[PDB]
Amino acid sequence: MRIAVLGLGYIGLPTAIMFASSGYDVVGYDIRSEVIKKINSGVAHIIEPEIDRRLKEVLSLGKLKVTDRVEDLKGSNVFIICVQTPLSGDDPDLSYLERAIRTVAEVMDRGALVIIESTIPPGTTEKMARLLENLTGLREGVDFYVAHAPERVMPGRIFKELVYNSRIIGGVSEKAANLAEKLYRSFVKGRIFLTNATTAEMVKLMENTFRDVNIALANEFALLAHQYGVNVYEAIELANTHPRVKIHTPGIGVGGHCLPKDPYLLLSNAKEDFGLIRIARRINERMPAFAAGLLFEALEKANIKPSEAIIAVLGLAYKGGTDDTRNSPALKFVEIIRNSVKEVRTYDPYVRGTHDSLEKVVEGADAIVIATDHPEFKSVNWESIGKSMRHKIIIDGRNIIKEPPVGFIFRGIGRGDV
Amino acid sequence: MRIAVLGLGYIGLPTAIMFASSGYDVVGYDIRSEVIKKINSGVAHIIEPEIDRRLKEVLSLGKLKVTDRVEDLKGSNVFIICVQTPLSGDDPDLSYLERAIRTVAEVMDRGALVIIESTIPPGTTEKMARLLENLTGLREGVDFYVAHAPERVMPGRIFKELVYNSRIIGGVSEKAANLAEKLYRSFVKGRIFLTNATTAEMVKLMENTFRDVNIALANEFALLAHQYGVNVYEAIELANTHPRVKIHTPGIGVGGHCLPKDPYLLLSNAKEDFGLIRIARRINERMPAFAAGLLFEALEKANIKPSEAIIAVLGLAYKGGTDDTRNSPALKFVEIIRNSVKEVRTYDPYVRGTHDSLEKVVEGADAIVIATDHPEFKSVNWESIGKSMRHKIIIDGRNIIKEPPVGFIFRGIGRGDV
Numbered sequence: 001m002r003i004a005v006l007g008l009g010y011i012g013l014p015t016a017i018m019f020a021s022s023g024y025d026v027v028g029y030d031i032r033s034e035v036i037k038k039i040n041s042g043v044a045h046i047i048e049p050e051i052d053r054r055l056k057e058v059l060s061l062g063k064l065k066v067t068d069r070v071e072d073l074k075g076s077n078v079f080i081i082c083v084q085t086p087l088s089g090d091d092p093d094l095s096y097l098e099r100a101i102r103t104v105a106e107v108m109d110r111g112a113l114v115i116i117e118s119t120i121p122p123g124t125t126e127k128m129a130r131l132l133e134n135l136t137g138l139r140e141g142v143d144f145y146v147a148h149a150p151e152r153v154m155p156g157r158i159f160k161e162l163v164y165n166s167r168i169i170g171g172v173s174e175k176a177a178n179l180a181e182k183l184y185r186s187f188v189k190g191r192i193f194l195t196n197a198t199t200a201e202m203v204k205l206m207e208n209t210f211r212d213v214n215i216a217l218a219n220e221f222a223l224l225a226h227q228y229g230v231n232v233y234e235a236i237e238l239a240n241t242h243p244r245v246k247i248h249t250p251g252i253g254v255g256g257h258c259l260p261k262d263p264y265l266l267l268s269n270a271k272e273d274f275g276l277i278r279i280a281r282r283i284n285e286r287m288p289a290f291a292a293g294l295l296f297e298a299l300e301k302a303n304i305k306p307s308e309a310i311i312a313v314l315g316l317a318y319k320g321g322t323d324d325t326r327n328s329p330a331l332k333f334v335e336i337i338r339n340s341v342k343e344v345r346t347y348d349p350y351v352r353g354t355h356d357s358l359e360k361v362v363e364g365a366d367a368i369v370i371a372t373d374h375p376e377f378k379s380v381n382w383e384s385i386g387k388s389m390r391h392k393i394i395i396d397g398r399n400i401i402k403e404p405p406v407g408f409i410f411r412g413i414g415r416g417d418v
Numbered sequence: 419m420r421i422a423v424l425g426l427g428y429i430g431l432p433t434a435i436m437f438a439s440s441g442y443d444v445v446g447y448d449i450r451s452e453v454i455k456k457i458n459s460g461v462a463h464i465i466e467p468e469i470d471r472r473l474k475e476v477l478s479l480g481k482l483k484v485t486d487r488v489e490d491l492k493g494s495n496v497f498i499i500c501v502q503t504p505l506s507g508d509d510p511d512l513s514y515l516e517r518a519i520r521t522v523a524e525v526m527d528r529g530a531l532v533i534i535e536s537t538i539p540p541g542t543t544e545k546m547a548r549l550l551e552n553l554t555g556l557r558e559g560v561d562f563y564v565a566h567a568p569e570r571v572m573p574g575r576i577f578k579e580l581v582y583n584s585r586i587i588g589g590v591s592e593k594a595a596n597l598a599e600k601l602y603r604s605f606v607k608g609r610i611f612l613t614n615a616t617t618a619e620m621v622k623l624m625e626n627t628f629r630d631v632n633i634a635l636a637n638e639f640a641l642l643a644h645q646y647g648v649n650v651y652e653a654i655e656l657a658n659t660h661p662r663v664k665i666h667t668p669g670i671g672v673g674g675h676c677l678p679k680d681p682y683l684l685l686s687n688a689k690e691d692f693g694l695i696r697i698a699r700r701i702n703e704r705m706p707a708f709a710a711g712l713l714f715e716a717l718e719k720a721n722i723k724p725s726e727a728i729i730a731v732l733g734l735a736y737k738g739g740t741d742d743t744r745n746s747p748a749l750k751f752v753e754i755i756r757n758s759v760k761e762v763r764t765y766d767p768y769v770r771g772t773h774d775s776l777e778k779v780v781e782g783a784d785a786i787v788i789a790t791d792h793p794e795f796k797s798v799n800w801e802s803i804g805k806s807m808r809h810k811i812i813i814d815g816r817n818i819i820k821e822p823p824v825g826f827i828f829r830g831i832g833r834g835d836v
């Protein structure tokens with residue numbers, strides 16, 4: 001059986017590779033000719049454990065082929081769309097999805113199964129099914145089938161979770177869901193639950209909104225910790241030993257391709273809400289500013305003129321271990337303080353900043369701001385680092401610092417114990 | 419050792435019993451003379467699995483004694499306060515706690531260990547330690563010791579969780595925490611984590627606020643489900659199969675002795691916050707009204723004038739399986755519709771309502787409102803019982819109804835699928 005995967009992003013490529021390694025002849029498609037060239041060389045354009053090893057495997061097996069030509073998709077039995085669905089202002093941007101749907105309409109044949117993996121507002125799958133019908137003259141549930149199979153994989157653990165995570169499949173028609181289930185069973189060992197399209201769409205958004213809201217609650221606990229003389233990270237670890245509690249982690253912010261917008265996708269077409277999801281978003285969105293407040297409070301303590309201060313921001317990626325800066329709170333932080341200080345330096349072991357090394361970025365700096373929890377920052381000799389700084393100041397926004405370095409002015413989000 | 423337990427509520431009495439059966443001589447104290455009389459013969463003034471069998475055991479072996487005489491507390495090596503800490507308007511009511519503390523001051527000796535189990539705002543344990551010092555002339559950490567040992571037990575499984583639950587102990591002094599740990603290790607098999615008083619106080623409140631806020635999030639998902647044509651309960655069950663997701667349960671309301679007030683205790687002395695905890699409380703507090711909205715909507719659909727409608731409320735307790743109505747949303751619901759309806763009937767298998775049976779309460783009724791998820795309601799033959807009603811209307815506020823009954827006008831919180 002032939003499967004076509006449209007959108008070879010950090011979830012689409014792994015998806016194509018996994019199916020190609022599970023018995024299917026797969027054709028990966030992406031409008032970006034640059035991405036196709038790189039993937040053909042056996043090396044992925046994205047960083048994800050095992051992706052290069054697995055990519056070469058399927059390329060050698062002859063089970064996976066990638067292209068940027070729509071024509072190569074003709075003859076596919078299944079079409080899986082994995083394109084991005086970011087916001088367009090305050091509205092969901094479904095242009096990438098519609099483009100992919102129209103491409104499928106061009107080559108689709110009777111009996112085809114179309115699966116939308118992209119995260120979308122409730123009602124989107126059915127609308128796209130109606131679009132396919134209008135462009136082909138065919139009928140969903142009779143001539144072709146459409147289903148929504150949202151992902152749950154965590155970047156950095158994608159191949160493992162693709163197999164072990166339980167997942168949901170919502171069919172526009174029952175047969176669509178049944179056909180899709182058989183497909184994923186080729187590698188999924190977790191449970192597969194079938195429902196309708198709208199329920200699957202809402203469930204996916206609910207998963208991510210639950211996460212975003214819980215991070216917001218954690219950040220409010222961080223604010224409260226300052227006033228009660230508590231180390232919020234310690235309090236959370238302690239609280240989480242309760243059989244029914246699993247408080248998330250507070251910090252400088254929430255980045256990535258999902259949490260910053262999925263809650264908005266969930267509210268997008270709602271004519272009525274309570275506002276809890278909205279305030280949680282505002283809370284997470286304001287943490288870079290929270291960190292800025294700690295920085296200026298520290299600079300004042302050290303009697304340092306802001307207009308002459310040199311700030312070293314450690315980390316640019318939206319989370320530790322990646323080179324991705326999508327919606328990174330570190331970037332927002334830089335944007336906030338750039339016009340309030342004399343110089344803002346940046347360093348990231350995975351992303352090119354103003355300086356290419358930690359030692360260099362802190363040399364002569366007045367303060368350090370830990371914006372990303374990269375592994376490199378967990379074994380730093382702050383004692384040695386401090387000796388090269390003009391002022392020993394550290395503002396931790398990622399729970400990197402545990403016991404504060406000696407002789408350093410230290411501030412941390414939720415660190416009311418210092 | 420001789421341990422004195424002040425406050426024999428559903429946490430205090432079991433605590434006293436556990437210590438009495440763990441190699442300690444215990445004296446349970448409570449101002450309520452009626453409660454004491456019941457205890458020493460009439461076993462447990464409260465209902466909890468195993469409490470009667472366990473109680474008789476410790477009373478018979480002479481390891482546990484209960485009294486309402488302060489004098490009997492003299493000679494105790496440890497004092498454990500388990501009194502209530504409800505709200506008084508918008509303020510935490512610590513009068514019961516202060517009373518217990520002053521009682522302890524009258525009978526304690528040098529070397530005494532004082533443990534506050536009661537849920538309290540951060541900083542309270544320290545303040546009570548200071549009060550004890552001013553009343554006795556002794557110094558904490560030298561002449562006596564104070565620690566906070568918050569509870570995590572769930573009514574209905576108290577003796578089980580008392581033993582296996584990991585718990586937190588925060589001492590005003592390090593020595594107090596160590597002493598308290600050796601004390602609780604007598605029956606606690608779960609992990610015991612030691613920290614300072616304020617951290618322990620905040621952790622306890624964070625646990626319950628996490629639960630409350632997550633219930634409010636679920637309630638917002640319920641509102642959204644109405645608009646997206648989704649059964650929120652099915653969506654939650656599906657979403658919770660995600661490795662990092664555990665959305666709580668929405669419904670008619672949040673009652674009990676804890677969740678309705680603990681978030682307020684957490685914010686009580688905070689000069690600044692973000693608002694998520696506060697607005698979440700408000701959301702849960704308006705769910706009885708949300709249910710009322712569904713009822714009136716259903717009556718309108720049935721062309722029934724509310725002023726002439728007979729409503730049958732099923733459930734009075736704050737949660738299924740108990741007779742406790744503390745802060746019950748069922749009571750709030752009745753109060754809300756009382757003057758808008760001709761007659762409000764109530765039935766609960768554990769607490770006597772206006773009618774003694776489901777059969778009698780629905781006879782000639784215009785609508786049924788399920789306010790508590792009692793076991794009895796889970797097997798009801800709704801179609802059969804509906805034959806005696808004036809109108810077949812059901813408003814479900816506890817997901818007791820799965821598949822809507824045939825011929826009924828059905829509405830349910832978060833039931834957008836009907």
Ligand SMILES: CC(=O)N[C@@H]1[C@@H](OP(=O)(O)OP(=O)(O)OC[C@H]2O[C@@H](n3ccc(=O)[nH]c3=O)[C@H](O)[C@@H]2O)O[C@H](C(=O)O)[C@@H](O)[C@@H]1O
Nearest residue numbers: 151152153207208211248249254255256258259318319662
């Ligand atoms: C409910 C859930 O766990 N969703 C996951 C989420 O993956 P995502 O790529 O957004 O990464 P993440 O680990 O949530 O991190 C996103 C952002 O949030 C931050 N973050 C994360 C957890 C936390 O407790 N605190 C916190 O501040 C991270 O630092 C990062 O800036 O979104 C994925 C997606 O929707 O592709 C989804 O498959 C994943 O399962």
Ligand SMILES: CC(=O)N[C@@H]1[C@@H](OP(=O)(O)OP(=O)(O)OC[C@H]2O[C@@H](n3ccc(=O)[nH]c3=O)[C@H](O)[C@@H]2O)O[C@H](C(=O)O)[C@@H](O)[C@@H]1O
Nearest residue numbers: 244569570571625626629666667672673674676677736737
């Ligand atoms: C974090 C946590 O699990 N806290 C527990 C809580 O026990 P509590 O006695 O308040 O009962 P509960 O099961 O939370 O129910 C309280 C109220 O909330 C409602 N409730 C509960 C869970 C849910 O998902 N949705 C919901 O609406 C119940 O119906 C009830 O009206 O408070 C206890 C306490 O503080 O004594 C504590 O020890 C328990 O561990």
